[PDB]
Amino acid sequence: LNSTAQGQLKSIIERVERLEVEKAEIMEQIKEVYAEAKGNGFDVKVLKKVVRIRKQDRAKRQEEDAILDLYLSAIGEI
Amino acid sequence: LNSTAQGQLKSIIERVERLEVEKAEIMEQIKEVYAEAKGNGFDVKVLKKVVRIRKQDRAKRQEEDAILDLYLSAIGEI
Amino acid sequence: LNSTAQGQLKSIIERVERLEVEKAEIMEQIKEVYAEAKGNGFDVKVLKKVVRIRKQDRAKRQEEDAILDLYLSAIGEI
Amino acid sequence: LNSTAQGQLKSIIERVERLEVEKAEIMEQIKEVYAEAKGNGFDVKVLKKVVRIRKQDRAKRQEEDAILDLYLSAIGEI
């Protein structure tokens, strides 16, 4: 690779790596919020599912939940 | 849950969700850098592996690579 | 690696690879059952979740579901 | 769901679950082979990578490896 290409490549890697640091920082801050939640007596596993489903299409989730319950009852789950 | 707990919970979710937005922003910026890389004629799949292995312990990676080559040759790969 | 070790290594790889073939065969049969399910008018995505949760500890799942609902209501989801 | 549908559904779940048992059995046998490998002085992590790459397109893997090395040298890795 020529001098120009080498320069570009170095810049690309440097820039991604700087952004990966920022991403790591934000992940640590998210951890810290859950750590505070745990210390205030909340269930972190459940909190994480709250955040997770609050990103899903709520109609689709409730639709799928209804079909799930229908199937569970049809196979005779008690 | 009482009023206090409700307040805490809302704050927790709000704060995580704000951080998830920031994380999404940073992921988009990482995509954009690779998009620029692609437009300058680089191999994005390979770039991503450069970044990935540049986070690993390089002694361990080279050690494992050596043992790999040893095993491949022992089973007669050509 | 000496002759003995080479023999062992070849046997190891051969045996794992034969088992991976069997695993692939079983995965294909699982796909086929869901294909039959789809052709009989069932919702395969939901079927897959039925199988998935039918492997979980049902007390823990229902416990977590209860706490989830409690949190969702506390943050005022409607 | 009517009687017919209930019957079909039960059959579907039963059949998938029987296949998941077989899959579990095969996974355990794969573990056992690696356990034997470990007891004969082999590096299981490396063995697993041997099996993994022996499923990839070897031209594509070597092509990507070459481009990788080219990029690593261009950014001045030592």
Author numbering:
A (entry chain A), B (entry chain A), C (entry chain A), D (entry chain A): 12 to 89
Reproduce the article's own wording on this structure.
GapR is an essential NAP in Caulobacter crescentus involved in DNA replication, chromosome segregation and cell division. In this paper we present three crystal structures of GapR from C. crescentus, crystallised in the presence of double-stranded DNA with a sequence from the origin of chromosome replication. In all three structures, GapR adopts the same overall tetramer ring form as seen by Guo et al., albeit with small but important increases in the diameter of the central channel. DNA could not be visualized in any of our three structures, but DNA could be detected in gel electrophoresis, indicating that DNA is present in the crystals.
The best diffracting crystals were of full-length GapR plus DNA. A diffraction dataset was collected which included reflections to 1.85 Å resolution and was of the space group I4132. We submitted the sequence of GapR to the Roβetta server for protein structure prediction, and the top five models produced were used as search models in molecular replacement. One of these models gave a possible solution, with residues 35–65 well placed in the electron density maps generated by Phaser9. A subsequent search model using only these residues gave a definite solution and the remaining residues other than the first 11 could be manually built into the electron density to give a final model at 1.85 Å with an Rfree of 0.223. In this structure, there is a single GapR monomer in the asymmetric unit. It has an extended N-terminal α helix followed by two shorter α helices. The three helices are relatively open and not bundled together, suggesting that this conformation would not be stabilized in the absence of a binding partner. Indeed, applying crystallographic symmetry assembles the monomers into repeating tetramer units which have a large central channel. Furthermore, in the I4132 and P4322 structures, a 19 bp DNA oligio would have to adopt substantial bends to thread through the central channel of adjacent tetramers, because channels formed by adjacent GapR tetramers do not line up.
